[PDB]
Amino acid sequence: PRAKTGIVRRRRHKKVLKRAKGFWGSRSKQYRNAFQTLLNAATYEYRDRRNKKRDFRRLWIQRINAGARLHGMNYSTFINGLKRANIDLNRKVLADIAAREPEAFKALVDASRNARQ
Amino acid sequence: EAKAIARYVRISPRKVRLVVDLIRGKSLEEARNILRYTNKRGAYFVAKVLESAAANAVNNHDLEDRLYVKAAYVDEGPALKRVLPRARGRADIIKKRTSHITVILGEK
Amino acid sequence: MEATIYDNTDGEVDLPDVFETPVRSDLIGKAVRAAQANRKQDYGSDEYAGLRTPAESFGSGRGQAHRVPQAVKGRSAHPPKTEKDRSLDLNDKERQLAVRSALAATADVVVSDDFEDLVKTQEVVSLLEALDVHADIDRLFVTSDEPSTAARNLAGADVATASEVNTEDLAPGRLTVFTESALAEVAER
Amino acid sequence: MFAIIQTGGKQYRVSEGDVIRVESLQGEAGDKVELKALFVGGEQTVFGEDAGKYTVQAEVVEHGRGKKIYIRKYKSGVQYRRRTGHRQNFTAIKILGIQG
RNA sequence: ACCGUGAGGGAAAGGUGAAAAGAACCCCGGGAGGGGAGUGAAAUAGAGCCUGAAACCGUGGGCUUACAAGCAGUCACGGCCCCGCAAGGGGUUGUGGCGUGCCUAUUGAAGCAUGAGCCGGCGACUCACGGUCGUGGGCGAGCUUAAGCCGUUGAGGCGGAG
RNA sequence: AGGUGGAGCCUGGGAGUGAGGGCGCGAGCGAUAACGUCCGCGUCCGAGCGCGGGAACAACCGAGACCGCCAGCUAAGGCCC
RNA sequence: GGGGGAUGACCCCAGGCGGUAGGGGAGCGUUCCCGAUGCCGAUGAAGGCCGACCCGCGAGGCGGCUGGAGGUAAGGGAAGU
């Protein structure tokens, strides 16, 4: 009934370590805060995990404005007019357009403005 | 190219370190006067580990002069765990951090 | 049923309701178990040492903290306590029961008394070539009252007796034979 | 060759470059299959029209493969004595943009 | 060994190889130690010389660094560098974007409350006899002491006070 | 009566804390003084009731965090930078 | 929980799922005893060193380099985990 756990623990650590890129001076191999720093980073990522998709909701937000206004108006106008829509409703991709295909964008831009006034 | 060395070398790894960090990657003969007429200990030593170096080559690793030190380094190891005044109660030992001494000698 | 009689070309014996039956794995092992059990050994770690020396666990209000365990080689913590009651007396009924149904498993092989006579471990090389295979692999000696002489020695020893030859016995995977007097243990059954 | 319809989720702006697509384990199985995908973003060869003008025709793409979670880890942790770990999910079966 | 006047305490430290065949000779050098040759299956197996990990000190290389904040970092986008799982990823980060470490005890904690400098190994709900419910199952009257006998393996089987 | 829907009751094994505060309200004390304490009715936090807001701020307004980075409507709260 | 499950599994929707003491269920590697008609390995036991297949996971497998001799158990048992 010997338990020389050995070889085992050591491993684990390696484990984490890996979890251990080459982050900040130390932890680097910090078989502790090493481990730690982790936990941290983690959850972080997480909250980041769901985060992002937001940072986007906005990103487009501007690149959007960049145009939405360009022509001559804001995203409480557009928007309103847009939803006046009926067989066509989207936002994301919209942007990355106005920039990709000017005409395209430019377009709706109209059909829009209108829908509105 | 060939190389010189020697462990169980009593001395300030560190100190040593400056040693080369000079004559470092440079013409043989050349630095061969750096350490000849530089200062701080190690030198002496340092010099030495350049002669059995220049030697070894030409002799068994072969084109003289055209040589130099593509690279040079030193490492510490073995310590010398040394005992001193018992905290006037508990022991306080230092360590003459032994000293390795490698160093290249390749031909131009 | 298919109570095959040895000597092969000779007769055939009946299967005794007993063996017949179904099976009972649970008890199965169990029988087992209550085997190794009453049959292992024991051990532990020093009583003297592991609580052997004096000890000046040190005052305190100094820079420390404190003849017991938790600083090296010494102590234990709850080790081999030889005083480790090892037995496990299954139970009669229990036991017997096992072997039974147990054997039952065996059935799934008839040793003519007449054999209780053959006199050389090369007469086994014989009554061997009689009926070999892999199950023989198993094998499993056993006469009926007083073992199958020489029959006892070879590269598969083991000579129970129409009395004394249980699961521990062959029960394991295994495959064997019993001299009538053997099925004299059945009576034990 | 560049259109932008929208599936059980926009996931759009394509034409031919098969676009890793959200699950759909009922029509999919169809290996290199064909199926309709309502439009609403008619952008082809510098000519556009309502995504409501569209909502009439559309396209279709061949049910290509079944991407297997493109790695992605989720260290679920906090100082608050709560840890745990689960790896990516979101795959998806791939399929080219059959344009028309 | 070692601290203790004493009674007493009371450590650490094992491993080359098949066997020495344990490194004649030549080299720089006062030497140790380093360069060749030779043993050799291998000596980065080489004399405290099997495996010989981490921490920690070096030598080169990629990337990166002087109007910049936080251990962390992780999400976005960009340039350099390599594509033995190539039209996808590696590594490093310039920016910006959201961010108070980690453990015990705490009404409540980033903590300026304590715990820890760093790494590796030891190190903490166990065993026995009772009793107690639950469950796996053998007979419903169910069940066995101690012992007697049998015992490569050593094979259990009889014992009926309770 | 019961639209509900999923709590309820008894028998039995295993438990933990056995000292909390914060807010609104109705009372006690208190200089109607205290992030004071003391009882009550609801909530609140519980080392995660983690996220939004109020700059920052357990905690008060809204919210119930199984998981899905380049979807969509709103809450409270906001929209000159 | 419920509608039929063939052993899987598949379909609906109800229905949540944040959680420390603490309660119930399920799994993972660690050194050993089986070798329940089990044995791999000098063209490497094992540990080590490094990785963009398998799993929610704790681990697996598997391939490249190292190193001198072991030990693995398809399954149940045990414990100085």
PDB file of C-alpha atoms (C1' of nucleotides) in Angstrom, chain B residues 5-6 17 24 44 48 52 56 59-61 74-75, chain E residues 27-28 30-36 57-60:
ATOM      1  CA  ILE B   5      36.537  24.765 -21.122  1.00  0.00           C
ATOM      2  CA  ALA B   6      36.893  23.626 -17.481  1.00  0.00           C
ATOM      3  CA  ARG B  17      31.162  36.664 -17.011  1.00  0.00           C
ATOM      4  CA  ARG B  24      34.104  37.926 -26.575  1.00  0.00           C
ATOM      5  CA  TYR B  44      44.569  34.901 -16.094  1.00  0.00           C
ATOM      6  CA  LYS B  48      44.392  29.873 -20.110  1.00  0.00           C
ATOM      7  CA  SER B  52      44.338  24.901 -24.881  1.00  0.00           C
ATOM      8  CA  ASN B  56      43.246  21.815 -29.445  1.00  0.00           C
ATOM      9  CA  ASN B  59      46.630  20.611 -33.235  1.00  0.00           C
ATOM     10  CA  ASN B  60      43.667  18.263 -33.641  1.00  0.00           C
ATOM     11  CA  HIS B  61      40.815  20.508 -34.824  1.00  0.00           C
ATOM     12  CA  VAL B  74      30.291  30.454 -18.523  1.00  0.00           C
ATOM     13  CA  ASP B  75      27.964  28.590 -16.177  1.00  0.00           C
TER      14      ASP B  75
ATOM     15  C1'   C E  27      48.403  18.093 -26.842  1.00  0.00           C
ATOM     16  C1'   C E  28      47.440  23.730 -23.616  1.00  0.00           C
ATOM     17  C1'   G E  30      51.685  25.339 -12.119  1.00  0.00           C
ATOM     18  C1'   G E  31      48.041  21.701 -11.486  1.00  0.00           C
ATOM     19  C1'   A E  32      42.941  20.531 -11.641  1.00  0.00           C
ATOM     20  C1'   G E  33      40.787  20.326 -15.802  1.00  0.00           C
ATOM     21  C1'   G E  34      40.031  20.638 -20.928  1.00  0.00           C
ATOM     22  C1'   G E  35      41.750  18.408 -27.011  1.00  0.00           C
ATOM     23  C1'   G E  36      42.753  14.054 -29.681  1.00  0.00           C
ATOM     24  C1'   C E  57      22.124  30.471 -13.692  1.00  0.00           C
ATOM     25  C1'   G E  58      23.943  30.579 -18.896  1.00  0.00           C
ATOM     26  C1'   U E  59      25.057  30.782 -24.806  1.00  0.00           C
ATOM     27  C1'   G E  60      22.561  31.869 -29.848  1.00  0.00           C
TER      28        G E  60
END
